[model samples]
Target chain A: GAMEKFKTLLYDIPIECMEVSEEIISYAKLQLGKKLNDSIYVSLTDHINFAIQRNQKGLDIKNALLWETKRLYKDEFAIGKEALVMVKNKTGVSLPEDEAGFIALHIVNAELNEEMPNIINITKVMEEILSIVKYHFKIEFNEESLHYYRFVTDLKFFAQRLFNGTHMEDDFLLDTVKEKYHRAYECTKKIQTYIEREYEHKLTSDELLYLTIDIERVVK
Target chain B: GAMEKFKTLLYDIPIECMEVSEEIISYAKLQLGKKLNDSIYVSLTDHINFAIQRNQKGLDIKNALLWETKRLYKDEFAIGKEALVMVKNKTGVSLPEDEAGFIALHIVNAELNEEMPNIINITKVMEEILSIVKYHFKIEFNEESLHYYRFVTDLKFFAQRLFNGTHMEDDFLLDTVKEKYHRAYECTKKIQTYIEREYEHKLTSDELLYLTIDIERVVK
Candidate 1:
């Protein structure tokens, strides 16, 4: 039963809380066809229970990535809001809208099999890089295009390496990219400057080479 | 109950066959850690039942990709062998080693959320390209390296597009890659020739460009 799964994995949460969480999880399974495995069940059940506790204490944690979460992920956020309604209908207290975005992020993380914190950081880096590329090229990118999708996938691994402090340096490759695609290489340099100034991580030659290639790709 | 899931999805399977399929599925869940979803159950159940029928009739379907499946996927092959032994123990009939490779490929396809035919084709393409790269460089690739992994990932999407008849061409980018990484681009040409001669799919400028870049990366 749902009660047993939570009881075994979690500390003594109120049975009431567990029931509500279980309902929410069942709802999630209906919406997102079940391949999520155990992690989603454990994480969301724990998340909603803690949200209830925080609300009872009259203070709640704010989701730092709520704005990005809302803007970028409409479908996941819509489901998140519906989950909030389910929470409200089941309980006397209503969790805030920020919790809705956090829940949406949780769903996103589950879908990608990624940790929430890293997914958040990855999104932020991708957005910053996209904005820089857009400004430099002065062109609207086709969000659904193959090249655009490739650029997004390209940036995901790049962002992971940035956060993990995994440096891949190749001066020869960097020189080649710079010499070959001068304008895109300059755009990547601007991105490099912004990344260092804002995120405080210096881009290595290999990173710059990939960034330049990706920039050249999307502009076409 | 286990009886209902197979009953609703499958037809005219013996109770004995269903029980064996159920056991094999349960064993898969135990080994794979319970995230594969219902498709695995339905597919494997139907597959095992049909295999039993074929063996009873003294005829069997041979998996064409068995050689590549054995070469590329050892872990999955081992599990498949265990599954074959379980079938033998439960029933007097013995499934061939080809069934083991097919089962291994089943696990691989399920892991990637890809159709079996596509995964088989993808493996063949990957093997051909890898052989060309190895022959050109005359150096062994470290399978665990980041660049090698990236090359494999790069080829997957490439192979998909090739099969789907999706074309991506860019003359300027191809010219730049050819000029910058002359030797690696020539290596990519060897791959292009082999693909044309063997797979009958001509490489686009964009494909050549990416292949050249990937080949250059892994050489370092």
Candidate 2:
């Protein structure tokens, strides 16, 4: 059921990086000096976000197309806990129990955001994370996919950060992240027209907003 | 429903960083900047994992805990595409839609390895970022509570460090980050025990492996 909806989001899934993801997770295991079942996924949505934040802050790279990728496909980003859904929604995607739990955490988070009939925390969570991903990652997606929404359970996290030492105003990366999000929004809007013409299903503005926010802006 | 289940995992819920399994995620966000929202719920899973990689490989940190926190937690993580059933069956936790998608990416890119994940073409990314965080700003943190995680995120921004060709991989700091994780895991295990004893919910070995692997680790 969910897969039917998520299939609408896939775009050149970077099959090459499969090994790389495997490698980095392995590195993570080594650093932690332990092993997680193959089923456990650490996921890298934040890495992409960090890349963008650096880019906007004027970080450089060689012949880098990450900016374009994020800008063009901003909505289809798997930055949150969605991977759990991807794994569970599909067969042969099983991870270890904890990994499964971890994935589940994200999935619940993703679904909770868009339960419709109006949910509170989901929108709020979306509002916050979308901003962080966009600003920090400095990339955006076309937002033409069904892979966008908010969650309330995730908002519990926001409350915690505030209590913790996370202060957005003191940091200067917010604007850069927001600017990238705007560009991503513009980029996604450009593609939505093509998708509407090519595919019978037209991307919704709200959906596009989800990805742009996640990749380009902070939830504020 | 998910929140009900997740409550079992709470160990004082540090209010914010407590939302995340890894303390490192709290740190990474500091480097990336704060949220646009009033609260910071979602954990930056992958970036923190990346930080662990850098820390283990010997990243320098003026404040060991802050560096560790960032390395442990990150804005982006890896995950798969499908969701829903996984959340219900695996962790009994549910999330919002966007949140699920974010975690999905983490599954896609996560490596079982702790060294680097190797999926994001990060060598160049890390190289460029090495300069900005270390050299550009005087990164500091208020170690009142879980805020150290945010401090760590700010401390180990690869894009920040990328400006200077020199990356800091201090042995002492790496050890410290590792120890912090070890203790965190120790707490995690303790909590797990509480869940198992109080709720009589027995976690699978694989799940426990992740639990153990995640909280406790050798920094370098």
For TM-score, the strongest prediction is 1
What stretches of model 2 exceed 4 Å from their correct place? A1-220, B1-79, B82-110, B113-120, B123-133, B136-220
Residue B166 C-alpha lDDT in model 2? 26
TM-score of chain A of each: 0.49, 0.20
User: Candidate 1 i-RMS (Å)?
Assistant: 17.4
Candidate 1 error regions (>4 Å): A1-115, A136-139, A169-183, B1-115, B169-183
Scored by lDDT, the top model is 1
lDDT of 2 by residue, B1-220 (tens): 3222111221222322222323323332443343321112223322222223333455322211111112222233212112323333333443333333443334322322222332234344333332323232333323232333322222223223322232221122123333435544454455456545643444433233323332222111
CAPRI quality of model 1: incorrect
The per-residue C-alpha lDDT of model 1 at residue A169 equals: 41
